Structure formats: C-alpha cells, structure tokens
Amino acid sequence: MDKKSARIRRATRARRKLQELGATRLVVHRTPRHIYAQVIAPNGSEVLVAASTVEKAIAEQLKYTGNKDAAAAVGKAVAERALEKGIKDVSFDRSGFQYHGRVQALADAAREAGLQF
Amino acid sequence: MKKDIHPKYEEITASCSCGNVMKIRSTVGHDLNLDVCSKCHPFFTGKQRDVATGGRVDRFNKRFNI
C-alpha cells in the first residue's frame, strides 16, 4: 500500500464511531511542511472553523512551519476561533496519525486554550 | 539501533601484504592482516591457467620433432 491509503485505513474506525455518536469533531491533518486543523459540523459536510500554517497570519509568527512550535500555534489559534463561535466541546479525531509529537502539541495546546475534549 | 542488544562494532585498520592499507568497521578488535584483497587478487589475470589446457598439436609436434 501507499502511505496515504494505509493512514486512511487507520483513520476509518474512529471516524465512523464519531459519526454514529454525532459529535462535532476537530480534524487534524499533518504534512512534513505544514499542519492543519478543521472543526466539522455533525453532518461532516460543512466546516465551522479552520486553521492552518498556510495562513500568512500564522506563518508570519513562526521560525518554521513543520515543527511542534507551529503546531502549538494552530492549536491555540483554532481553539480561539472556535470559542468565538461558541463551539466549546469537540471530539478529537487524530485522522490516523499517532497521538504524538506535533499532533499532541496541537491537541494539548487547544485544551489549554479552553476547548473541552 | 536498540542500544542494548547489538554486539560491539568498531573501526579497525586492515593491511594486505600487497601493501594495500585500509580502514573498516568490524565486530573485532584485531587489526586485519590480509593475504589477499580485491586489488591484488589474481582473478583479472589468472584465467590463462585453463586456456593452456586446450592445446594438443603444439604438444605432439615436440615428439614429432624429436
């Protein structure tokens, strides 16, 4: 298999479970150069909030976009925008990455920013 | 590398009697004295040993001459 399909295999079971629970989910996506976050409505088909290192507003603050420091930035940034829309509680969907390193730095940054998960 | 499990692995010098001198890593502490190396090994010259087996008439003419 390619790495993309293998990751999607890993991601599937959690995503299906969250759909059956009907939770609003925070979806991370990771790349060697960048990291992304989206908050998606319970239908799964519309995005309530997004944050990414491709945004100049965030990239301008950073030495480099592909490291744990950049991930912590988007974790604070996404949580602020979400609370500005009142989306206080979410479920974390790790999208088949390990809950480690950059993804953990993002998630636990969003918790300290006051998002309940 | 899992730190505990692997054997000692170390740089050693090697010396061939052809005068070739070399450095390698190895699992041993000895300096590697060598009888042959890929430089001096005769493979690129020695094949002639078998071709000498093909001749026949250049043997008999010795008896025929004598």
């Binding site: - | 590398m1 054997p7 890593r25 190895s26 699992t27 041993v28 890929s38 493979f43 094949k47």
Partner: protein, 177 residues
C-alpha cells in the same frame, strides 16, 4: 560510508551519461541488503539456531531476527511457528559498510573464485548470491567454528531491469565473472 560517497560522486554521474536518464532521481539506488541463514537443523538442536545466529551477528554487527515456519510442512517435519532460520536486513550506513567489506575483503577469500555469475538477477534488478562457508568473513575465528554453514546475500535496488541493475553493480567493480 566510503562507498556511499563514491556513489554520489561517480556512479550516479556515469550512469546518467550511460542510460541518459533525465533526472538524478531516476538513477538506480541500493535500498537494503538482507542476509539469510536457513538453519533448518533447528528442528533438532536449538543450540544450532543460536550458534548460527551468533555468526550472523558477527558478520553483520546486529542481532538477527529468528524466522518462524510460515506453515507446517510434513515433508520436513516442521510445524507452524517452529524456528527455521534467521535473517538480518541492513540499511543506511551499516549497509554500505558491509557492502564495502563484502567486495573488498570477503569475496576474494572464496575458494577458486573466478567471479560471480552475471545472470543471478530476479528480472527486476535485485541480485542474490550464496556463500558456501562462513570463513570468507574474518570476523569468524577459524579456530572456534563448530560447523560449516553458509548464508544467502540479497541486494535489493530501485533498478527497473537487470541491465540497469547489472550496470549499477559493475560500477562498483562488483566482481562479476
């Protein structure tokens, strides 16, 4: 690793000019080297599997993975899960170091060595070769060997065909017959 720089500075550029590849990424690369001892007699005495594992460790410099029977075969009285062999896979620096040792000192010690067969390719640029006895590697102390034992070498490459794979190895003066 020494031979790695030789690849970067000579092999890649000459291969570029030889096949006229358009991108440096298209040039073949060595991915891994794998050593295998099919011990077999581990069905009798487990110390033999251990002793064979110690030899691969000395040759390769890393602990071998013992390989279990994929399925039971009455033809050899093996049940599934029995140890049958051990393997080592070499990558990166220690791959190039072993590769250098093999060419420069090991294969010269083969008895009546005339060079390796140039046709021992699987059809997709991977080269595999056997050795009859462990003594070709100086790390094995001749004074202490218990039994004769050989092993298989396999070299895996990104080459697409045997002509490309053969060109890659020959560029190292890999001693083909």
């Amino acid at each position: 690793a020494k031979l790695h720089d030789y690849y970067k500075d000579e092999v890649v550029k000459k291969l570029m000019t030889e096949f006229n590849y358009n991108s440096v990424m298209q040039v073949p690369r060595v991915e891994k080297i794998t050593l295998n001892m099919g011990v077999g007699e581990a069905i009798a005495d487990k110390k033999l599997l251990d002793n064979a594992a110690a030899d691969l460790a000395a040759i390769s410099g890393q602990k071998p993975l013992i390989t279990k029977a994929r399925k039971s075969v009455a033809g050899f009285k093996i049940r599934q899960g029995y140890p049958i062999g051990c393997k080592v896979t070499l990558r990166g620096e220690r791959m190039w170091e072993f590769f250098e040792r093999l060419i420069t000192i090991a294969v010269p010690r083969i008895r009546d060595f005339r060079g390796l067969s140039a046709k021992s390719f699987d059809g997709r640029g991977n080269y595999s070769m056997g050795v009859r006895e462990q003594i070709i590697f100086p790390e094995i102390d001749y004074d202490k060997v218990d039994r004769v034992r050989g092993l298989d070498i396999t070299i895996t490459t990104t080459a697409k065909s045997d002509e490309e794979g053969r060109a890659l190895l020959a560029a190292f003066d890999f001693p083909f017959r």
